[PDB]
Structure 1
Amino acid sequence: TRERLLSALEDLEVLSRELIEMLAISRENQVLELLIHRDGEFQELMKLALNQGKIHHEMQVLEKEVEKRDSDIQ
């Protein structure tokens, strides 16, 4: 994916820094699950980008015969 991954990967990074700071100040729990809730979705989204990677190869090849066909009828 494009928009969601950046939206999520920038979320993960910002969230992680705060957690370290929270650990640092000591030496909440609603956010600990919230990291896990974000954790359980980009790994699903990670294979989504990989799935479209095989997809990109498929789209380009089809055009090849589209263009040569267009020349053939022209």
Structure 2
Amino acid sequence: TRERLLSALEDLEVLSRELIEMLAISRENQVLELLIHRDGEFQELMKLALNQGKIHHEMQVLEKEVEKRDSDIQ
């Protein structure tokens, strides 16, 4: 999640920016439904970021395994 986080970052930031004045001019929900839509969206992303984190760091071990194996071959 690279281009996805920034897309989730910029959408949630400008939508949070959007909700500031609509509360201010009252003293809608179409912009609110996208907030929770991106809320449950981006909750997948840092979970998928740590999914990438556990996968990336698992591959670090595996290539450390085969480096010794190749060296043992070597």
> How large is the RMSD of aligned CA atoms in angstroms?
1.7
SS for the counterpart of 1:70 is helix
Alpha-carbon displacement from aligned partner over 1:4-51 (angstroms, at most 9, x marks no partner):
111112211111011011111222321111212111211122211112
CA distance in 2, matches of 1:40, 1:57: 26
What percent of counterpart residues are identical? 100
Secondary structure of 1:25 counterpart: helix
TM-score (norm: length of structure 1):
0.78
TM-score by length of 2: 0.78
More moved, 28-37 vs 59-68: 59-68
Q: Which moved more, 1:33-42 or 1:59-68?
A: 59-68
Name the structure, 1 or 2, with higher relative contact order (CA <8 Å, separation 6+). 1
Aligned residues between the structures? 74
8 Å Cα contact 2:15/2:31 also seen in 1: no
What 5-or-longer segments of structure 1 have no aligned partner? none
After the TM superposition, list the runs of 4 or more consecutive aligned residues in structure 1 that deviate by more than 6 angstroms. Answer: none
Q: Bigger shift: 62-71 or 18-27? A: 62-71
